[PDB]
Amino acid sequence: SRPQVTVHSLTGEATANALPLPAVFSAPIRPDIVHTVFTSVNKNKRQAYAV
RNA sequence: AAACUUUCAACAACGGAUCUCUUGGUUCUCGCAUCGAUGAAGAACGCAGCGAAAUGCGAUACGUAAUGUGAAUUGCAGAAUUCCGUGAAUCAUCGAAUCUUUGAACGCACAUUGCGCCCCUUGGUAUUCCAGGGGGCAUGCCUGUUUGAGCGUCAUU
Secondary structure (H helix, E strand, O other): OOOOEEEEOOOOOEEEEEEOOOOOOOOOOOHHHHHHHHHHHOOOOOOOOOO
C-alpha cells in the first residue's frame, strides 16, 4: 500500500477524503525513453514540403 | 622638399551585399462538377472628362436594368444630393438586356472590309424605281412534312 493523496476543494481547502496512489507514479522515470519516443512522436504531426 | 607611385586612415563617390519585411510562389489535404451552333476558347477593332499595361465592356461600349447596402468617388479636373430616401457609390449581388469585326464560323467566295438572294418593310406619286430599318439563306444526320419521280411491284368487266 501507498502513502495516500488528499483531495482539495474549489476554495483550496483540504477535504477529509483521501485517495490511494494509482501505482503509475511508481513507474520507472526514464528520461532516455521519453526523449527517444518524443522525438519520433513530434515528427508525426508534420506535413510534406517539396520544390 | 613638392609632384609622382604605393600603404594606411578620415570624408565623400560608386555598387546593391547583409538584416528585416512580403496582397507572391511551392507542396499537402478537403469539397464540388460548372465550356460551345442560344455560338465558346482564342484573335482583332474600339469604348472613360483626363490613361500605358492590367482589369471591365461592346455604338446601350471601364457600362444599362434589376436586388441589397445606405451617402460617396478621389491621381487630377469637373459635376452632384433634397441626404428622414426610389438613393451618392470604379460599392456588393446578379436572374433582364445590348453584345462591333472575326474565330468550330455557317449566304457565295478568296487573302475580295467584294459577290448576292428572300422575307418583313418606314419613307422618297410610289405602278415605275431610290433610300433606310430588321430577320434569315453552311454541312452531315435523325424524326417528320410535302410536292413529286420511278415498265419497282400488284390490283383492274
